[PDB]
Design an enzyme around this catalytic site. Structure first.
Site, PDB file in Angstrom:
ATOM      1  N   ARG A 169     -21.322  -4.794  -6.904  1.00 14.41           N
ATOM      2  CA  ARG A 169     -20.151  -4.121  -6.329  1.00 14.41           C
ATOM      3  C   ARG A 169     -18.898  -4.481  -7.076  1.00 14.41           C
ATOM      4  O   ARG A 169     -18.119  -3.600  -7.396  1.00 14.41           O
ATOM      5  CB  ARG A 169     -19.994  -4.457  -4.853  1.00 14.41           C
ATOM      6  CG  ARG A 169     -21.136  -3.884  -4.075  1.00 14.41           C
ATOM      7  CD  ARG A 169     -21.326  -4.507  -2.748  1.00 14.41           C
ATOM      8  NE  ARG A 169     -22.544  -4.006  -2.106  1.00 14.41           N
ATOM      9  CZ  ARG A 169     -23.162  -4.644  -1.150  1.00 14.41           C
ATOM     10  NH1 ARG A 169     -22.686  -5.802  -0.715  1.00 14.41           N
ATOM     11  NH2 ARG A 169     -24.267  -4.138  -0.636  1.00 14.41           N
ATOM     12  N   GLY A 195       2.491  -4.019  -1.357  1.00 14.28           N
ATOM     13  CA  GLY A 195       2.936  -3.745  -2.717  1.00 14.28           C
ATOM     14  C   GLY A 195       2.195  -4.547  -3.766  1.00 14.28           C
ATOM     15  O   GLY A 195       1.724  -3.983  -4.743  1.00 14.28           O
ATOM     16  N   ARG A 227       6.766 -11.965   5.142  1.00 13.22           N
ATOM     17  CA  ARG A 227       7.509 -11.778   6.382  1.00 13.22           C
ATOM     18  C   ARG A 227       6.662 -11.704   7.633  1.00 13.22           C
ATOM     19  O   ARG A 227       7.213 -11.614   8.722  1.00 13.22           O
ATOM     20  CB  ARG A 227       8.293 -10.473   6.322  1.00 13.22           C
ATOM     21  CG  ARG A 227       9.248 -10.375   5.198  1.00 13.22           C
ATOM     22  CD  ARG A 227      10.290 -11.423   5.165  1.00 13.22           C
ATOM     23  NE  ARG A 227      11.530 -10.824   4.695  1.00 13.22           N
ATOM     24  CZ  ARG A 227      12.643 -11.488   4.517  1.00 13.22           C
ATOM     25  NH1 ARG A 227      12.693 -12.805   4.775  1.00 13.22           N
ATOM     26  NH2 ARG A 227      13.720 -10.829   4.080  1.00 13.22           N
ATOM     27  N   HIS A 237     -17.564 -12.752  -0.970  1.00 15.42           N
ATOM     28  CA  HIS A 237     -18.053 -11.408  -1.248  1.00 15.42           C
ATOM     29  C   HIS A 237     -17.374 -10.689  -2.398  1.00 15.42           C
ATOM     30  O   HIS A 237     -18.026  -9.949  -3.130  1.00 15.42           O
ATOM     31  CB  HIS A 237     -17.972 -10.566   0.035  1.00 15.42           C
ATOM     32  CG  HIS A 237     -18.841 -11.068   1.139  1.00 15.42           C
ATOM     33  ND1 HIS A 237     -19.034 -10.364   2.309  1.00 15.42           N
ATOM     34  CD2 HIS A 237     -19.625 -12.172   1.230  1.00 15.42           C
ATOM     35  CE1 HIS A 237     -19.879 -11.027   3.080  1.00 15.42           C
ATOM     36  NE2 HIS A 237     -20.247 -12.130   2.450  1.00 15.42           N
ATOM     37  N   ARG A 278     -26.014  -9.712  -4.026  1.00 15.86           N
ATOM     38  CA  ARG A 278     -25.797  -8.290  -4.053  1.00 15.86           C
ATOM     39  C   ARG A 278     -24.349  -7.890  -4.171  1.00 15.86           C
ATOM     40  O   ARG A 278     -24.049  -6.719  -4.391  1.00 15.86           O
ATOM     41  CB  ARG A 278     -26.469  -7.631  -2.843  1.00 15.86           C
ATOM     42  CG  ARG A 278     -27.981  -7.834  -2.855  1.00 15.86           C
ATOM     43  CD  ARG A 278     -28.654  -7.202  -4.114  1.00 15.86           C
ATOM     44  NE  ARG A 278     -30.091  -6.964  -3.956  1.00 15.86           N
ATOM     45  CZ  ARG A 278     -30.802  -6.222  -4.774  1.00 15.86           C
ATOM     46  NH1 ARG A 278     -30.224  -5.656  -5.833  1.00 15.86           N
ATOM     47  NH2 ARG A 278     -32.064  -6.059  -4.546  1.00 15.86           N
ATOM     48  N   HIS A 279     -23.448  -8.861  -4.061  1.00 15.82           N
ATOM     49  CA  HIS A 279     -22.005  -8.590  -4.198  1.00 15.82           C
ATOM     50  C   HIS A 279     -21.666  -8.348  -5.648  1.00 15.82           C
ATOM     51  O   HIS A 279     -20.711  -7.646  -5.912  1.00 15.82           O
ATOM     52  CB  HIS A 279     -21.166  -9.744  -3.654  1.00 15.82           C
ATOM     53  CG  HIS A 279     -21.528 -10.119  -2.261  1.00 15.82           C
ATOM     54  ND1 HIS A 279     -21.277  -9.294  -1.183  1.00 15.82           N
ATOM     55  CD2 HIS A 279     -22.191 -11.198  -1.774  1.00 15.82           C
ATOM     56  CE1 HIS A 279     -21.763  -9.866  -0.092  1.00 15.82           C
ATOM     57  NE2 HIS A 279     -22.309 -11.026  -0.417  1.00 15.82           N
ATOM     58  N   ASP A 334       8.357 -11.360  -4.702  1.00 16.93           N
ATOM     59  CA  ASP A 334       9.658 -10.725  -4.741  1.00 16.93           C
ATOM     60  C   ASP A 334      10.623 -11.513  -3.865  1.00 16.93           C
ATOM     61  O   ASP A 334      10.311 -12.621  -3.403  1.00 16.93           O
ATOM     62  CB  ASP A 334       9.547  -9.223  -4.412  1.00 16.93           C
ATOM     63  CG  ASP A 334       9.239  -8.934  -2.952  1.00 16.93           C
ATOM     64  OD1 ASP A 334       8.984  -9.911  -2.181  1.00 16.93           O
ATOM     65  OD2 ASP A 334       9.284  -7.737  -2.511  1.00 16.93           O
ATOM     66  N   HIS A 335      11.832 -11.003  -3.701  1.00 18.85           N
ATOM     67  CA  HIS A 335      12.841 -11.656  -2.893  1.00 18.85           C
ATOM     68  C   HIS A 335      12.489 -11.769  -1.401  1.00 18.85           C
ATOM     69  O   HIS A 335      12.908 -12.730  -0.755  1.00 18.85           O
ATOM     70  CB  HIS A 335      14.175 -10.911  -3.051  1.00 18.85           C
ATOM     71  CG  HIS A 335      14.096  -9.455  -2.695  1.00 18.85           C
ATOM     72  ND1 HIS A 335      13.342  -8.545  -3.411  1.00 18.85           N
ATOM     73  CD2 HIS A 335      14.655  -8.760  -1.675  1.00 18.85           C
ATOM     74  CE1 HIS A 335      13.430  -7.359  -2.840  1.00 18.85           C
ATOM     75  NE2 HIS A 335      14.245  -7.456  -1.801  1.00 18.85           N
ATOM     76  N   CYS A 374       4.671 -10.553  -1.176  1.00 16.76           N
ATOM     77  CA  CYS A 374       5.837  -9.731  -0.853  1.00 16.76           C
ATOM     78  C   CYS A 374       5.959  -9.611   0.654  1.00 16.76           C
ATOM     79  O   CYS A 374       5.269 -10.315   1.377  1.00 16.76           O
ATOM     80  CB  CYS A 374       5.819  -8.413  -1.627  1.00 16.76           C
ATOM     81  SG  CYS A 374       4.587  -7.153  -1.192  1.00 16.76           S
ATOM     82  N   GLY A 375       6.875  -8.802   1.143  1.00 18.17           N
ATOM     83  CA  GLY A 375       7.096  -8.705   2.584  1.00 18.17           C
ATOM     84  C   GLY A 375       5.858  -8.554   3.428  1.00 18.17           C
ATOM     85  O   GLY A 375       5.631  -9.303   4.388  1.00 18.17           O
ATOM     86  N   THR A 376       5.030  -7.574   3.087  1.00 19.35           N
ATOM     87  CA  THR A 376       3.834  -7.278   3.840  1.00 19.35           C
ATOM     88  C   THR A 376       2.578  -7.585   3.087  1.00 19.35           C
ATOM     89  O   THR A 376       1.463  -7.488   3.643  1.00 19.35           O
ATOM     90  CB  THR A 376       3.797  -5.781   4.200  1.00 19.35           C
ATOM     91  OG1 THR A 376       3.761  -5.012   2.974  1.00 19.35           O
ATOM     92  CG2 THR A 376       5.032  -5.359   4.982  1.00 19.35           C
ATOM     93  N   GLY A 377       2.706  -7.840   1.789  1.00 21.37           N
ATOM     94  CA  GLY A 377       1.526  -7.961   0.945  1.00 21.37           C
ATOM     95  C   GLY A 377       1.034  -6.662   0.357  1.00 21.37           C
ATOM     96  O   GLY A 377       0.288  -6.677  -0.631  1.00 21.37           O
TER      97      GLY A 377
END
Lengths: 145, 145, 145, 145
Positions: free
Chosen positions: B138, B72, B111, B100, B134-135, B10-11, B67-70
């Site tokens: 899952r 979203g 950001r 894993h 074993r992963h 995003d922006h 995105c800003g924080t990841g």
């Protein structure tokens, strides 16, 4: 303290899950522990589904999911429309998860963070309102799959 | 360098997206940039879907979403069966996401982290094999929704 | 395993200090534990000095210091010429602390990080050589006070 | 906004140093920039000393020091009695650096964190009071070398 939490973890994050549960219980917060109930090896998606079901059925207000890194839980829980599960490694992430993403599940990394940091993240998550505004369109778009 | 990356942001994470793209291009890695192409305000799920489609169609090997924080992006991308999008804040997280979780999308917080740290995370993500073992059970369970 | 570690913590990081000590002992690494030896309240600078003295006297090869956040230890230990104490929150920081700063004390935040992450940081710290080069001038300048 | 900041960086953290400086200037905070003034290679301890001198002479209220990881600055600045330089990677660390350590220099990692995160750390650092209490003995003990 009138908030109900559904919590679950795999075996790798069992210890932190227990500490977080007890922290919440000590504040008089209602906690439903969906397991796991030991350190015997289990599969994280089985536990994601139990917390998810509880959130989607309106049986809990917020979920807390934990595995070793948080990654498995962040992937598994977000398979479900209506679920916004946020992997937060420090309190500002939980703040933004709530403010911007209206997150309804907090995901924590059980092998990566300390308990006291986890407690601060939890307190932030449970005490931050959703801002609404321009974020609402984005959260709706998540579920336009 | 024979790996194809689909990238989008995003922006809020446009600047880091551009730096990551150019870093990859400088190593001769094939990059498809799905946008956004400026800092004008856009909605992250629109961009998650473009990278997702590219991964699900086998048109790229790995995705990178920012995105800003990841948060979203980690939520929006993981709506899709077959997608394992991992929000990584340091290289060991990317290592485990691959080892894993057999992650096929790397999510970065535009950001929150520095470019040189992002580059190390990207290098780890692209160079770590899946362990299987074993992963595998899952990862299959994630898609048994 | 022929490396000797001097370790110490205050009461806030006692639990992690114990886990790190036992991790090292389990690999056959020689560890001198300078305390503290319980969770009764103590003052971090008293413990910084014990590890410092051990490093400056060439009685240990590396130090590990822990308090709640690592900040107190990072301040107290770096009062001494010849000491390069590095507060590391993830393995790449420990890598660079060694490669670039020739760090001789690792500082860990006992309330902020998980034990398994701490173990990875410790392994990186103990297994990374100093690069020398242009870093050497900088490390000498630290002690030109 | 009546707080005076002395800031400095090496070449590796020049970009973030500039962004932090401009952020402060935009709030009307008085900033003295001790350099460096380009990306040409320099040695971090030379810049630590300039900010240190400004704090010890009571010419600034707080310092901000930046290098690639923050480690070099955290080591170099803490050589001086009266200086409490705190390497903070997220806002709660800055909060505790102030509350518990009465920190007078904030150290930031110029290649590791994003600018907007750095701004939040700076805002927390500048707006948090020292708690005093039992922390005062510990801060005095740091300088009983």
């Amino acid at each position: 303290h009138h908030v109900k939490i559904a919590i679950a973890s795999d075996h790798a994050a069992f210890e932190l899950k227990e500490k977080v549960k007890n922290y919440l219980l000590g504040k008089g917060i209602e906690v439903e522990d969906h397991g796991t109930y030991s350190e015997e090896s289990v599969d994280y998606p089985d536990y994601a589904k139990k917390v998810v079901q509880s959130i989607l059925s309106n049986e809990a207000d917020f979920g807390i999911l934990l595995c070793g890194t948080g990654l498995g839980m962040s992937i598994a829980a977000n398979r479900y429309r209506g679920i916004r599960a946020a992997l937060c490694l420090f309190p500002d992430m939980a703040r933004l998860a709530r403010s911007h993403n209206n997150a309804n599940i907090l995901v924590l990394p059980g092998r990566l963070i300390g308990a006291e940091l986890a407690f601060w993240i939890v307190d932030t998550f449970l005490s931050t309102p959703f801002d609404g505004g321009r974020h609402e369109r984005r959260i709706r778009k998540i579920d336009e799959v």
